Design a protein around this ligand. Structure first.
Ligand SMILES: OC[C@H]1O[C@H](Oc2ccc(-c3ccccc3)cc2)[C@@H](O)[C@@H](O)[C@@H]1O
Length: 158
């Protein structure tokens, strides 16, 4: 089991970490969602589906910088919504193919009432998402750590 980003940055068998730089909607109003869809950014696969089944969860999702200070968050994992920053490990998504399958993670961030102006700074860390991978074959329990950075400023009109 291993993962890679859209630009081809890989995290190999055994886990590790990678930086993910994402484009954000430049203008987000109060009452609207800023959507950070990682399913277009992160792809994983099973290296031995003939014999092994892989289990993948969002173990933990943390908010940083402007997202932590200026947004109320929800994370959608494989069709279900949970608080973001997270309060528990999600259910599993099964990986049973050698063909790449997106990691079905999306952040839904809406501005808090106090937000206004540059709510996210370009180049700043906005989130850390931990993909936890196990299986039905051995004792492997690996973390794939995804550090999410903003490519641009995000303004909340006042
Ligand atoms: O995706 C599946 C797994 O791929 C890796 O582990 C193994 C472990 C054993 C074998 C193997 C076993 C018998 C004969 C030949 C190869 C192949 C892969 C490792 O990533 C792991 O966590 C992940 O569940």
């Amino acid at each position: 089991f291993a993962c890679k980003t859209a630009n081809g940055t890989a995290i190999p068998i055994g886990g590790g970490s990678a930086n993910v730089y994402v484009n954000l909607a430049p203008v987000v109003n109060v009452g609207q969602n800023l959507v950070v869809d990682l399913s277009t950014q992160i792809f994983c696969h099973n290296d031995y589906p003939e014999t092994i089944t892989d289990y993948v969860t969002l173990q933990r999702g943390s908010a940083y910088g402007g997202v932590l200070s200026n947004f109320s968050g929800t994370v959608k994992y494989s069709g279900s919504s949970y608080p973001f920053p997270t309060t528990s490990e999600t259910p599993r998504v099964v990986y049973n193919s050698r063909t790449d399958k997106p990691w079905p993670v999306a952040l839904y961030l809406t501005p808090v009432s106090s937000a206004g102006g540059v709510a996210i700074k370009a180049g700043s860390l906005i989130a850390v998402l931990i993909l936890r991978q196990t299986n039905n074959y051995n004792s492997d329990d690996f973390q794939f750590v995804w550090n999410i950075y903003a490519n641009n400023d995000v303004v909340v009109p006042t």
